[PDB]
Amino acid sequence: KASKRTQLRNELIKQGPKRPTSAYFLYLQDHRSQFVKENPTLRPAEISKIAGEKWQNLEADIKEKYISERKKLYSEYQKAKKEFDEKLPPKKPAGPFIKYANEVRSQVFAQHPDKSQLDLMKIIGDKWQSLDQSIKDKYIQEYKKAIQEYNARYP
Amino acid sequence: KASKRTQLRNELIKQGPKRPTSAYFLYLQDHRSQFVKENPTLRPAEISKIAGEKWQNLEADIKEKYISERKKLYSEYQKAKKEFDEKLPPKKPAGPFIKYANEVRSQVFAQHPDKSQLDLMKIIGDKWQSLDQSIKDKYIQEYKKAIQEYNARYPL
DNA sequence: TTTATTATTTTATATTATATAA
DNA sequence: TTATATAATATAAAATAATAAA
DNA sequence: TTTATTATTTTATATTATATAA
DNA sequence: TTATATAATATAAAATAATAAA
């Protein structure tokens, strides 16, 4: 259940740029009217089933075109997505354990090549548990500066 | 997920007058700081219970004082709802079968005094199925004039 | 909750590169 | 990480909500 | 989805006449 | 109809969401 700030982001992200239409769908729009002219008898659900197999069928010249147009459209979206996401309110600084895990995950993975990252996180948890206090405090004190700057920057 | 004209009503309904609080809560808000000072150790939930026990054993002359106040506030709330509900857009006109059910409900219930509203409606639903077509048209024609008038007074 | 009619909403479909859920 | 939702759309047909009274 | 810490959120509780759900 | 939710409050305390990276 999202909290007040995640609702805001979620609501803010929702008004962000939307993913571009599928490459097929661009081809569908062009031959949608023709296709209705091809057949008024069949259901709209039937419409898309027959139309679907047209797309597989198209010669590469026309097909690829659409695909390429989708590539170009997606690229325009992804630029907007990066600039949109950078501008929106920042999440809170990660906690002491997270920063620690982030520093040692690389060595812990090399010492456990078989383990998935979920098991790495379990491992790093017990590593954090066994950490000396003084070492933990370094992460805890470091977090204090983190939210301190975060609170002074964003009061 | 509901019809649009209806959806405007629902958003309007939420702005409507809210029902007043109980008589216990009037008494609680009046004596809340007193209980905590009498019971500084007790948790928030613990003090609510202390207040309830005080409420159960409260002098009845003062206890009725809140009851009567609560009665004053609920009347105000009631008058607000009437005036508020009369001002909001109207509900859709009832279906043909519904008006039939209402007209014939009295008679059907006398035939079956051992039946709940739910059961009686199944009986009345069987009666509508066998109802004459000329009779069924009467309600159906009546309903059409109602929604058509409804749409005129409450256009989308 | 029940009922029947009707006004209104959801679904059914195609495609996939990735954003997102987890 | 892997598994799943999403982006676009037309539109018949299928699903359901509205409605009253107890 | 996993981890620990930390921030945020819900709950624990009294009452009870009616309104609302079903 | 019957069965459950509701209106109000405090605010400690218990619960849970945020938080990265894969």
Short mmCIF file of C-alpha atoms (C1' of nucleotides) in Angstrom, two decimals:
data_model
loop_
_atom_site.label_atom_id
_atom_site.label_comp_id
_atom_site.label_asym_id
_atom_site.label_seq_id
_atom_site.Cartn_x
_atom_site.Cartn_y
_atom_site.Cartn_z
CA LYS A 1 0.00 0.00 0.00
CA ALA A 2 1.76 3.10 -1.23
CA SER A 3 2.29 5.90 1.24
CA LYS A 4 1.78 9.61 0.63
CA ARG A 5 4.96 10.17 -1.38
CA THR A 6 4.72 6.96 -3.42
CA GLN A 7 1.13 7.81 -4.35
CA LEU A 8 2.43 11.20 -5.47
CA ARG A 9 5.24 9.66 -7.54
CA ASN A 10 2.93 6.94 -8.86
CA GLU A 11 0.35 9.61 -9.71
CA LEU A 12 3.15 11.80 -11.08
CA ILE A 13 4.69 8.91 -13.03
CA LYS A 14 1.22 8.18 -14.45
CA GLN A 15 1.12 11.58 -16.18
CA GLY A 16 4.64 10.97 -17.47
CA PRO A 17 5.29 10.04 -21.09
CA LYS A 18 3.49 6.88 -22.15
CA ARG A 19 5.17 4.00 -23.94
CA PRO A 20 4.75 4.23 -27.72
CA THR A 21 2.38 1.99 -29.64
CA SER A 22 3.50 -1.40 -30.93
CA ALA A 23 5.03 -1.64 -34.40
CA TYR A 24 2.26 -4.03 -35.46
CA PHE A 25 -0.32 -1.55 -34.23
CA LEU A 26 1.03 1.13 -36.54
CA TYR A 27 0.53 -1.30 -39.41
CA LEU A 28 -2.90 -2.14 -38.00
CA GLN A 29 -4.03 1.49 -38.05
CA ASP A 30 -3.13 1.85 -41.74
CA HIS A 31 -5.02 -1.25 -42.86
CA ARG A 32 -7.75 -1.10 -40.22
CA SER A 33 -10.09 0.91 -42.44
CA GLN A 34 -9.22 -1.11 -45.53
CA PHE A 35 -9.62 -4.26 -43.47
CA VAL A 36 -13.09 -3.19 -42.39
CA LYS A 37 -13.73 -2.57 -46.08
CA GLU A 38 -12.29 -6.05 -46.70
CA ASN A 39 -14.88 -7.59 -44.33
CA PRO A 40 -17.87 -6.08 -42.44
CA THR A 41 -19.26 -9.51 -41.50
CA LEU A 42 -16.60 -10.74 -39.07
CA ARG A 43 -16.44 -9.64 -35.44
CA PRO A 44 -13.97 -6.97 -34.26
CA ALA A 45 -12.30 -9.78 -32.32
CA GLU A 46 -12.19 -11.70 -35.61
CA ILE A 47 -10.85 -8.57 -37.29
CA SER A 48 -7.67 -8.61 -35.22
CA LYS A 49 -7.09 -12.37 -35.49
CA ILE A 50 -6.92 -12.32 -39.31
CA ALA A 51 -5.12 -8.99 -39.20
CA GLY A 52 -2.59 -10.43 -36.79
CA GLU A 53 -1.42 -12.98 -39.35
CA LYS A 54 -1.07 -10.28 -41.98
CA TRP A 55 1.74 -8.72 -39.94
CA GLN A 56 3.76 -11.94 -39.90
CA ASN A 57 3.07 -12.14 -43.63
CA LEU A 58 4.23 -8.68 -44.77
CA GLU A 59 7.29 -8.50 -46.94
CA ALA A 60 10.30 -7.24 -45.05
CA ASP A 61 10.37 -3.89 -46.90
CA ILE A 62 6.98 -2.69 -45.60
CA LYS A 63 7.22 -4.61 -42.34
CA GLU A 64 10.68 -3.43 -41.37
CA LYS A 65 9.54 0.10 -42.13
CA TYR A 66 6.97 -0.01 -39.37
CA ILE A 67 9.47 -1.71 -37.07
CA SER A 68 12.01 1.02 -37.82
CA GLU A 69 9.36 3.67 -37.22
CA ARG A 70 8.67 2.01 -33.86
CA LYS A 71 12.40 2.03 -33.10
CA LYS A 72 12.45 5.78 -33.79
CA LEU A 73 9.30 6.35 -31.75
CA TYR A 74 10.58 4.37 -28.81
CA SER A 75 13.82 6.33 -28.83
CA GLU A 76 11.91 9.62 -28.63
CA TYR A 77 9.94 8.22 -25.69
CA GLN A 78 13.04 6.96 -23.87
CA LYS A 79 14.65 10.38 -24.04
CA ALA A 80 11.48 11.86 -22.57
CA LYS A 81 11.39 9.08 -19.98
CA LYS A 82 14.92 9.83 -18.75
CA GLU A 83 14.33 13.58 -18.56
CA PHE A 84 10.95 13.02 -16.91
CA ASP A 85 12.27 10.58 -14.30
CA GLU A 86 15.25 12.77 -13.37
CA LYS A 87 12.99 15.77 -12.70
CA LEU A 88 10.60 14.11 -10.24
CA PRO A 89 10.91 14.14 -6.41
CA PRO A 90 13.80 12.00 -5.16
CA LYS A 91 13.31 8.94 -3.04
CA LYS A 92 14.75 8.91 0.46
CA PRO A 93 18.39 7.89 1.05
CA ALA A 94 18.88 4.17 1.47
CA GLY A 95 19.30 2.80 4.97
CA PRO A 96 22.56 1.76 6.66
CA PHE A 97 22.25 -1.92 5.69
CA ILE A 98 21.47 -1.14 2.07
CA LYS A 99 24.57 1.01 1.55
CA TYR A 100 26.64 -1.64 3.24
CA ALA A 101 25.21 -4.44 1.11
CA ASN A 102 25.82 -2.24 -1.91
CA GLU A 103 29.50 -1.96 -1.04
CA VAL A 104 30.19 -5.65 -0.33
CA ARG A 105 27.79 -7.33 -2.74
CA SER A 106 30.55 -7.48 -5.35
CA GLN A 107 32.99 -9.39 -3.15
CA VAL A 108 30.24 -11.56 -1.66
CA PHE A 109 29.12 -12.62 -5.13
CA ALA A 110 32.69 -13.55 -6.11
CA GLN A 111 32.90 -15.66 -2.94
CA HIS A 112 29.54 -17.29 -3.83
CA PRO A 113 29.25 -17.61 -7.62
CA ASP A 114 26.44 -20.17 -7.39
CA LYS A 115 24.09 -18.02 -5.31
CA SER A 116 21.30 -15.90 -6.71
CA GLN A 117 21.21 -12.28 -5.62
CA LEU A 118 18.28 -13.06 -3.31
CA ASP A 119 20.53 -15.60 -1.55
CA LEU A 120 23.34 -13.05 -1.64
CA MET A 121 21.05 -10.66 0.21
CA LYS A 122 20.32 -13.32 2.81
CA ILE A 123 24.08 -13.92 3.13
CA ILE A 124 24.89 -10.20 3.34
CA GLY A 125 22.21 -9.86 5.99
CA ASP A 126 23.98 -12.35 8.22
CA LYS A 127 27.25 -10.65 7.36
CA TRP A 128 25.71 -7.39 8.56
CA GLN A 129 24.38 -9.11 11.68
CA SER A 130 27.87 -10.33 12.55
CA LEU A 131 29.52 -6.96 11.82
CA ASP A 132 31.23 -5.32 14.75
CA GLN A 133 29.22 -2.43 16.20
CA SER A 134 31.84 0.22 15.36
CA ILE A 135 31.66 -0.94 11.72
CA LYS A 136 27.84 -0.77 11.70
CA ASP A 137 27.95 2.70 13.28
CA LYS A 138 29.98 3.91 10.31
CA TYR A 139 27.03 3.03 8.09
CA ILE A 140 24.50 4.37 10.59
CA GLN A 141 26.40 7.63 11.04
CA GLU A 142 26.88 7.84 7.27
CA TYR A 143 23.12 7.49 6.84
CA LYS A 144 22.62 10.35 9.31
CA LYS A 145 24.62 12.66 7.05
CA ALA A 146 22.62 11.27 4.12
CA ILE A 147 19.17 12.19 5.39
CA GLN A 148 20.66 15.31 6.99
CA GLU A 149 21.71 16.60 3.58
CA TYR A 150 18.42 15.23 2.25
CA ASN A 151 16.38 17.11 4.85
CA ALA A 152 18.39 20.33 4.52
CA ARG A 153 18.24 20.09 0.71
CA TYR A 154 14.53 19.22 0.70
CA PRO A 155 13.04 20.66 3.93
CA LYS B 1 -16.99 1.06 -13.31
CA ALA B 2 -20.51 2.46 -13.16
CA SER B 3 -22.65 4.59 -15.46
CA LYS B 4 -21.54 8.22 -15.89
CA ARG B 5 -24.65 10.13 -14.86
CA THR B 6 -24.61 7.89 -11.85
CA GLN B 7 -20.91 8.50 -11.29
CA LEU B 8 -21.50 12.25 -10.93
CA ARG B 9 -24.11 11.46 -8.29
CA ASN B 10 -21.74 9.20 -6.35
CA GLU B 11 -19.01 11.86 -6.16
CA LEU B 12 -21.69 14.33 -5.09
CA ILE B 13 -22.97 11.93 -2.43
CA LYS B 14 -19.58 11.86 -0.67
CA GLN B 15 -19.72 15.62 -0.08
CA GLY B 16 -23.03 15.04 1.73
CA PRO B 17 -23.73 15.70 5.40
CA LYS B 18 -22.01 13.20 7.69
CA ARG B 19 -23.92 11.55 10.52
CA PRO B 20 -23.25 13.04 13.97
CA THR B 21 -21.21 11.29 16.58
CA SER B 22 -22.60 9.16 19.40
CA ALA B 23 -23.58 10.49 22.81
CA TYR B 24 -20.69 8.55 24.34
CA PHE B 25 -18.19 10.49 22.22
CA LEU B 26 -19.59 13.87 23.22
CA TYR B 27 -19.10 12.77 26.82
CA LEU B 28 -15.67 11.34 26.00
CA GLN B 29 -14.34 14.50 24.34
CA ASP B 30 -15.58 16.48 27.36
CA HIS B 31 -13.82 14.33 29.97
CA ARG B 32 -10.81 12.95 28.05
CA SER B 33 -8.02 15.02 29.60
CA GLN B 34 -9.56 14.34 33.01
CA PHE B 35 -9.21 10.58 32.60
CA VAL B 36 -5.58 10.71 31.45
CA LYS B 37 -4.61 12.83 34.46
CA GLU B 38 -6.43 10.34 36.68
CA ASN B 39 -4.63 7.55 34.79
CA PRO B 40 -1.31 8.92 33.54
CA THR B 41 0.16 5.45 33.07
CA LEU B 42 -2.65 4.07 30.90
CA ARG B 43 -2.36 3.61 27.14
CA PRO B 44 -4.67 5.45 24.74
CA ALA B 45 -6.73 2.31 24.18
CA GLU B 46 -6.82 1.67 27.92
CA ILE B 47 -8.36 5.08 28.62
CA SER B 48 -11.17 4.60 26.08
CA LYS B 49 -12.16 1.57 28.13
CA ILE B 50 -12.01 3.51 31.39
CA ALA B 51 -14.27 6.08 29.75
CA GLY B 52 -16.70 3.37 28.67
CA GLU B 53 -17.00 2.01 32.19
CA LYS B 54 -17.58 5.55 33.44
CA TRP B 55 -20.21 5.95 30.73
CA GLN B 56 -22.08 2.77 31.68
CA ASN B 57 -22.26 3.80 35.36
CA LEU B 58 -22.72 7.53 34.68
CA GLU B 59 -25.47 9.39 36.54
CA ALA B 60 -28.53 9.05 34.35
CA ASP B 61 -29.60 12.70 34.60
CA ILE B 62 -26.29 13.89 33.15
CA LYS B 63 -26.06 10.83 30.87
CA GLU B 64 -29.40 11.80 29.29
CA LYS B 65 -27.96 15.30 28.82
CA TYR B 66 -25.65 13.97 26.10
CA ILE B 67 -28.37 11.68 24.75
CA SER B 68 -30.57 14.75 24.31
CA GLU B 69 -27.71 16.71 22.74
CA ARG B 70 -27.02 13.81 20.41
CA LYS B 71 -30.72 13.87 19.58
CA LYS B 72 -30.46 17.56 18.71
CA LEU B 73 -27.49 16.95 16.41
CA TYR B 74 -29.02 13.97 14.64
CA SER B 75 -32.11 16.04 13.83
CA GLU B 76 -29.83 18.68 12.30
CA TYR B 77 -28.07 15.96 10.31
CA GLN B 78 -31.45 14.61 9.22
CA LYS B 79 -32.61 18.01 7.97
CA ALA B 80 -29.33 18.44 6.11
CA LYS B 81 -29.66 15.09 4.34
CA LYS B 82 -33.23 15.81 3.21
CA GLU B 83 -32.29 19.20 1.79
CA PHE B 84 -29.03 17.86 0.37
CA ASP B 85 -30.54 14.73 -1.18
CA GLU B 86 -33.41 16.70 -2.74
CA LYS B 87 -30.81 18.92 -4.44
CA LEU B 88 -28.82 16.11 -6.05
CA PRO B 89 -29.53 14.64 -9.50
CA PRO B 90 -32.29 12.03 -9.53
CA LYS B 91 -31.91 8.29 -9.45
CA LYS B 92 -32.68 6.48 -12.69
CA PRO B 93 -36.37 5.58 -13.09
CA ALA B 94 -37.22 2.09 -11.85
CA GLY B 95 -37.60 -0.84 -14.22
CA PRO B 96 -41.00 -1.97 -15.47
CA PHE B 97 -41.06 -5.17 -13.41
CA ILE B 98 -40.21 -3.20 -10.27
CA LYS B 99 -43.32 -1.02 -10.53
CA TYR B 100 -45.41 -4.08 -11.28
CA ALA B 101 -43.94 -5.78 -8.23
CA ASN B 102 -44.85 -2.80 -6.08
CA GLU B 103 -48.44 -2.56 -7.28
CA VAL B 104 -49.13 -6.27 -6.83
CA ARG B 105 -46.91 -6.81 -3.75
CA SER B 106 -49.76 -6.35 -1.25
CA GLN B 107 -51.98 -8.93 -2.93
CA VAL B 108 -49.19 -11.48 -3.46
CA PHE B 109 -48.06 -11.18 0.16
CA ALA B 110 -51.57 -11.88 1.45
CA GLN B 111 -51.56 -15.10 -0.58
CA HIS B 112 -48.18 -16.08 0.92
CA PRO B 113 -47.74 -14.72 4.48
CA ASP B 114 -44.99 -17.30 5.19
CA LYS B 115 -42.55 -15.79 2.66
CA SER B 116 -39.69 -13.31 2.86
CA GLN B 117 -39.27 -10.34 0.54
CA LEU B 118 -36.66 -12.32 -1.40
CA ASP B 119 -39.00 -15.29 -1.90
CA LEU B 120 -41.99 -13.09 -2.73
CA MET B 121 -39.98 -11.42 -5.47
CA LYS B 122 -39.34 -14.80 -7.08
CA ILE B 123 -43.10 -15.38 -6.97
CA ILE B 124 -43.76 -11.94 -8.47
CA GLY B 125 -41.05 -12.64 -11.05
CA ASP B 126 -42.96 -15.73 -12.06
CA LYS B 127 -46.11 -13.65 -12.28
CA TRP B 128 -44.47 -11.15 -14.63
CA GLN B 129 -43.36 -14.02 -16.85
CA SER B 130 -46.96 -15.18 -17.32
CA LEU B 131 -48.30 -11.62 -17.28
CA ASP B 132 -50.32 -10.78 -20.39
CA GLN B 133 -48.39 -9.04 -23.15
CA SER B 134 -50.85 -6.15 -23.27
CA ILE B 135 -50.33 -5.71 -19.53
CA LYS B 136 -46.55 -6.05 -19.81
CA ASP B 137 -46.59 -3.37 -22.48
CA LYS B 138 -48.41 -0.99 -20.10
CA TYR B 139 -45.53 -0.96 -17.63
CA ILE B 140 -42.95 -1.06 -20.44
CA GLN B 141 -44.56 1.93 -22.17
CA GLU B 142 -44.81 3.65 -18.77
CA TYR B 143 -41.10 3.12 -18.08
CA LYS B 144 -40.02 4.47 -21.46
CA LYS B 145 -41.80 7.75 -20.84
CA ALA B 146 -40.02 7.97 -17.48
CA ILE B 147 -36.43 7.50 -18.67
CA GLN B 148 -37.16 9.70 -21.66
CA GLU B 149 -38.38 12.38 -19.28
CA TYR B 150 -35.47 11.57 -16.97
CA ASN B 151 -32.98 12.19 -19.78
CA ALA B 152 -34.64 15.53 -20.56
CA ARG B 153 -34.39 16.78 -16.98
CA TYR B 154 -30.93 15.26 -16.38
CA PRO B 155 -29.05 15.37 -19.70
CA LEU B 156 -25.55 13.95 -19.93
"C1'" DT C 1 -29.52 -10.28 -0.48
"C1'" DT C 2 -34.55 -11.34 -4.52
"C1'" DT C 3 -36.61 -10.19 -9.09
"C1'" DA C 4 -36.69 -8.13 -14.77
"C1'" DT C 5 -35.79 -4.61 -17.59
"C1'" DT C 6 -32.65 -1.57 -19.50
"C1'" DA C 7 -28.38 1.63 -19.55
"C1'" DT C 8 -23.74 1.11 -19.23
"C1'" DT C 9 -19.31 -1.20 -18.73
"C1'" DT C 10 -15.96 -5.13 -19.84
"C1'" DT C 11 -14.32 -8.24 -22.91
"C1'" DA C 12 -12.45 -10.12 -26.87
"C1'" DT C 13 -8.62 -10.00 -30.13
"C1'" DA C 14 -4.09 -9.00 -32.78
"C1'" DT C 15 1.76 -7.93 -31.60
"C1'" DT C 16 6.28 -7.70 -28.69
"C1'" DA C 17 10.18 -4.80 -27.04
"C1'" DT C 18 10.63 -3.50 -22.42
"C1'" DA C 19 8.78 -1.19 -18.45
"C1'" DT C 20 7.45 -2.92 -14.44
"C1'" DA C 21 5.95 -6.26 -10.87
"C1'" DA C 22 8.18 -9.13 -7.39
"C1'" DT D 1 17.34 -11.38 -11.13
"C1'" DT D 2 12.65 -13.57 -13.41
"C1'" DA D 3 7.97 -13.32 -14.42
"C1'" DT D 4 4.24 -10.45 -16.02
"C1'" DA D 5 1.80 -6.22 -17.31
"C1'" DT D 6 1.76 -2.51 -21.00
"C1'" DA D 7 1.56 0.34 -25.05
"C1'" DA D 8 -1.76 1.32 -29.08
"C1'" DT D 9 -7.70 0.48 -31.21
"C1'" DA D 10 -12.12 -0.64 -33.29
"C1'" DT D 11 -16.57 -2.41 -31.99
"C1'" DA D 12 -19.90 -6.40 -31.96
"C1'" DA D 13 -21.06 -9.16 -28.20
"C1'" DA D 14 -21.06 -10.55 -23.48
"C1'" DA D 15 -21.13 -9.10 -18.58
"C1'" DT D 16 -23.20 -6.11 -15.02
"C1'" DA D 17 -25.24 -2.27 -12.65
"C1'" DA D 18 -29.30 0.52 -11.67
"C1'" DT D 19 -33.60 0.27 -9.66
"C1'" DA D 20 -37.43 -0.75 -4.93
"C1'" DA D 21 -38.90 -2.80 -0.98
"C1'" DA D 22 -38.23 -6.00 3.10
"C1'" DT E 1 11.05 -11.46 -5.00
"C1'" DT E 2 15.63 -11.25 -0.68
"C1'" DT E 3 18.02 -8.34 3.37
"C1'" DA E 4 17.99 -4.41 8.21
"C1'" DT E 5 17.19 -0.18 9.30
"C1'" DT E 6 14.25 3.52 9.36
"C1'" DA E 7 10.17 6.14 8.23
"C1'" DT E 8 5.32 5.96 7.84
"C1'" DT E 9 0.89 3.83 8.76
"C1'" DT E 10 -2.54 1.28 10.87
"C1'" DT E 11 -4.50 -0.50 15.34
"C1'" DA E 12 -6.00 -0.68 19.77
"C1'" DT E 13 -10.59 0.88 22.25
"C1'" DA E 14 -14.75 2.90 24.43
"C1'" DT E 15 -20.61 3.77 22.27
"C1'" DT E 16 -24.77 2.72 19.80
"C1'" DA E 17 -28.84 4.74 16.89
"C1'" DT E 18 -29.22 4.22 12.40
"C1'" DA E 19 -27.58 4.10 8.14
"C1'" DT E 20 -25.87 1.28 4.84
"C1'" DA E 21 -24.57 -3.50 2.80
"C1'" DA E 22 -26.34 -7.62 1.04
"C1'" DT F 1 -35.65 -8.24 5.61
"C1'" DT F 2 -30.88 -9.13 8.25
"C1'" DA F 3 -26.15 -8.24 9.04
"C1'" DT F 4 -22.55 -5.22 9.35
"C1'" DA F 5 -20.58 -0.57 9.04
"C1'" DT F 6 -20.58 4.24 10.77
"C1'" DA F 7 -20.01 8.79 13.11
"C1'" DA F 8 -16.71 10.95 16.38
"C1'" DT F 9 -11.15 11.07 19.56
"C1'" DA F 10 -6.65 10.49 21.36
"C1'" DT F 11 -1.86 8.81 20.51
"C1'" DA F 12 1.16 5.10 22.28
"C1'" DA F 13 2.38 1.08 20.19
"C1'" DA F 14 2.44 -2.45 16.83
"C1'" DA F 15 2.60 -3.10 11.88
"C1'" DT F 16 4.30 -2.18 7.61
"C1'" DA F 17 6.17 0.46 3.83
"C1'" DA F 18 10.55 2.51 1.84
"C1'" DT F 19 14.86 1.68 0.28
"C1'" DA F 20 18.71 -0.65 -3.60
"C1'" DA F 21 20.26 -4.07 -6.73
"C1'" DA F 22 19.41 -8.53 -9.85
#
